[PDB]
Design a protein around this ligand. Sequence first.
Ligand code: HEC
Length: 125
Amino acid sequence: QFAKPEDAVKYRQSALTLMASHFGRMTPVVKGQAPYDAAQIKANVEVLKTLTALPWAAFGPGTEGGDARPEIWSDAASFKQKQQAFQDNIVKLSAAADAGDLDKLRAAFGDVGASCKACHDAYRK
Ligand code: HEC
């Protein structure tokens, strides 16, 4: 859906920014510094889940640019695996949120976080 590569770069960076916000805003809850309201969390995780599926389609062929490493394109299969694992961890977070269990949530949150990091290590400049 993009006219120039720059437009895909801007879309994905935007999507990733939103994801960051929706994920990162739960840190105080998870650490116990903010109160835990199951419903609030469930709903935030629902938004997070939607957002988390969005960036990937904006790393299509010829969208080189931004802080994305070329390896994303040279090593597509490995990138895809990285994204799938990430999304899978997201499913897990969602399950924890739906169960309204802080322990499970904390654990799941950590797993999501390691997944973001694993990708960045390999594919973000
Ligand atoms: C690979 C499968 C990734 C996963 C999982 C996550 N991120 Fe990442 N992120 C990735 C790339 C290749 C890039 C660079 C994109 C570019 O074209 O510039 C990024 C970038 C970000 C950013 C920066 C956004 C901006 O303002 O430019 C943020 C804030 C970011 N990523 C955060 C983030 C978080 C919080 C994740 C887990 C919830 C996450 N990313 C997963 C690749 C991948």
